[PDB]
Amino acid sequence: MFKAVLFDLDGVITDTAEYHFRAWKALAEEIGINGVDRQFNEQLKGVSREDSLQKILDLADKKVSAEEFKELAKRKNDNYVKMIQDVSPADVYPGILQLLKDLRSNKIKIALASASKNGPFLLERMNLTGYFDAIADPAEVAASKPAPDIFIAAAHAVGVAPSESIGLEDSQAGIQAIKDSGALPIGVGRPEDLGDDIVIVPDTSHYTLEFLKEVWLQK
Amino acid sequence: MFKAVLFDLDGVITDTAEYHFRAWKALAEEIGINGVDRQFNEQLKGVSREDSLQKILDLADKKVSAEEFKELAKRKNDNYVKMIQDVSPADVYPGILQLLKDLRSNKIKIALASASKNGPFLLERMNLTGYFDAIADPAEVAASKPAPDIFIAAAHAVGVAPSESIGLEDSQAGIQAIKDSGALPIGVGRPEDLGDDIVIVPDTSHYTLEFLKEVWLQK
Numbered sequence: 001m002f003k004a005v006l007f008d009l010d011g012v013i014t015d016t017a018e019y020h021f022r023a024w025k026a027l028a029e030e031i032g033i034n035g036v037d038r039q040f041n042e043q044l045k046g047v048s049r050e051d052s053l054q055k056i057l058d059l060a061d062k063k064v065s066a067e068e069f070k071e072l073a074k075r076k077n078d079n080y081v082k083m084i085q086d087v088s089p090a091d092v093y094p095g096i097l098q099l100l101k102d103l104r105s106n107k108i109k110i111a112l113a114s115a116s117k118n119g120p121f122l123l124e125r126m127n128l129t130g131y132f133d134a135i136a137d138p139a140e141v142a143a144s145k146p147a148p149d150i151f152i153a154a155a156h157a158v159g160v161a162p163s164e165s166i167g168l169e170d171s172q173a174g175i176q177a178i179k180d181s182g183a184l185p186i187g188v189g190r191p192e193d194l195g196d197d198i199v200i201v202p203d204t205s206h207y208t209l210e211f212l213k214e215v216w217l218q219k
Numbered sequence: 220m221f222k223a224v225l226f227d228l229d230g231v232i233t234d235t236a237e238y239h240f241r242a243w244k245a246l247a248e249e250i251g252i253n254g255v256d257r258q259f260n261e262q263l264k265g266v267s268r269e270d271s272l273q274k275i276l277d278l279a280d281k282k283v284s285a286e287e288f289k290e291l292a293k294r295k296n297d298n299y300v301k302m303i304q305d306v307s308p309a310d311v312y313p314g315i316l317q318l319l320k321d322l323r324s325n326k327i328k329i330a331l332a333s334a335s336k337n338g339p340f341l342l343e344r345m346n347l348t349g350y351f352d353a354i355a356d357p358a359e360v361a362a363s364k365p366a367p368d369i370f371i372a373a374a375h376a377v378g379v380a381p382s383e384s385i386g387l388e389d390s391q392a393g394i395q396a397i398k399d400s401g402a403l404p405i406g407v408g409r410p411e412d413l414g415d416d417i418v419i420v421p422d423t424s425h426y427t428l429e430f431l432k433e434v435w436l437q438k
């Protein structure tokens with residue numbers, strides 16, 4: 001019977017994508033480039049700041065100094081951090097608070113397996129700190145998803161092997177990183193995105209202790 | 220005020236996409252090709268029967284006689300047609316029937332702008348034919364989505380300019396066809412897929428007569 005659950009943050013617990021998007025939007029407009037819409041920002045999901053910034057510059061063919069490039073990246077980051085001050089318990093995805101409580105009361109370990117450098121602050125803002133047994137530091141992790149490194153650390157830090165764990169992810173890269181860590185992925189989203197070898201729920205309200213017990217029994 | 224609503228079928232009124240998938244899968248399973256999952260089926264969405272089969276053959280760099288190519292295409296279409304025999308009013312997306320009635324009783328014209336060769340059949344099976352004043356024949360149009368041809372043809376069929384019409388659609392190419400017809404689009408889905416510049420509802424339950432009216436005003 002699974003001993004831990006390793007939570008993705010963005011797309012499972014909450015939406016950080018929205019704030020990163022407004023942040024890139026504000027910076028693009030601040031400096032006159034158009035065409036940073038939610039469609040275009042599908043290419044700024046996952047990639048680091050350098051890559052994102054290049055793709056926004058590459059839109060108006062703006063040329064910038066190494067000095068200018070560092071500052072713009074920094075004003076995007078200052079933006080992002082200002083905007084996530086708003087985050088409240090109101091921002092938690094359906095079913096998640098009730099899943100965290102059910103897991104805690106069944107003595108199942110709870111770990112965050114997220115690339116957010118803001119994970120600890122976001123879990124405090126949403127008043128979930130008390131549920132989480134460990135937060136994998138993405139700064140202590142050698143490669144991002146689809147490398148399993150983040151899921152292995154999250155497992156190790158609550159004292160379980162990944163093979164004793166379920167991972168919940170929203171992204172195709174995250175599903176891959178769970179599979180390669182040895183954990184059982186349960187997806188949220190569409191099989192068109194995440195694949196049809198793994199069990200997927202349409203939305204997070206379907207992530208129940210009783211559903212996760214059902215899936216563990218049938219692997 | 221808008222005089223007509225122009226409806227997509229698949230993704231608005233019901234789901235055909237899933238039976239297509241099953242047919243391409245059961246066909247690929249039979250000829251010994253692997254890798255036809257719902258991820259890959261996303262690349263057949265829009266494509267002709269002919270090119271759909273090619274893309275399944277290209278998965279195994281494989282060729283067959285131009286004669287048996289047509290028997291495969293046929294075997295798959297025969298299979299699709301067997302599977303939609305069970306379509307019923309139970310398969311109509313939420314809000315859609317309530318919307319059709321509200322439109323009718325407000326003397327507002329209702330037309331299918333679908334690429335389905337089986338549109339009329341499906342409408343009978345879902346007992347919607349009575350709500351529909353016209354069905355754009357997709358065989359009688361020069362170019363498929365994202366060309367406007369089908370939304371133009373649908374508007375003309377009920378005696379209005381596209382510019383007097385709202386078009387509801389779930390795909391990026393559909394939205395484009397609606398935009399280039401002169402009609403107002405309202406997407407169902409994700410701005411990440413359909414665009415920032417048009418109004419989008421998360422699902423078909425939000426397509427209310429009252430909501431369409433609010434959008435028609437605010438453009």
Ligand SMILES: O=P(O)(O)CC[C@@H]1O[C@H](CP(=O)(O)O)[C@@H](O)[C@H](O)[C@H]1O
Pocket residue numbers: 008009010011016020044045046047113114115116117118171
């Ligand atoms: O600037 P940061 O927030 O520190 C790191 C960037 C974001 O982190 C997310 C965390 P998760 O999905 O793994 O929870 C990823 O999904 C995004 O695609 C990624 O752009």
Ligand SMILES: O=P(O)(O)CC[C@H]1O[C@@H](CP(=O)(O)O)[C@H](O)[C@@H](O)[C@@H]1O
Pocket residue numbers: 227228229230235263264265266332333334335336337390
């Ligand atoms: O074989 P058929 O059913 O005759 C034609 C098949 C096409 O049907 C459309 C229905 P609609 O969305 O335009 O209503 C889908 O969007 C396409 O993805 C699909 O390839």
Ligand SMILES: [Mg+2]
Pocket residue numbers: 008009010011012169170171174
């Ligand atoms: Mg995520």
Ligand SMILES: [Mg+2]
Pocket residue numbers: 227228229230231388389390393
């Ligand atoms: Mg459609």
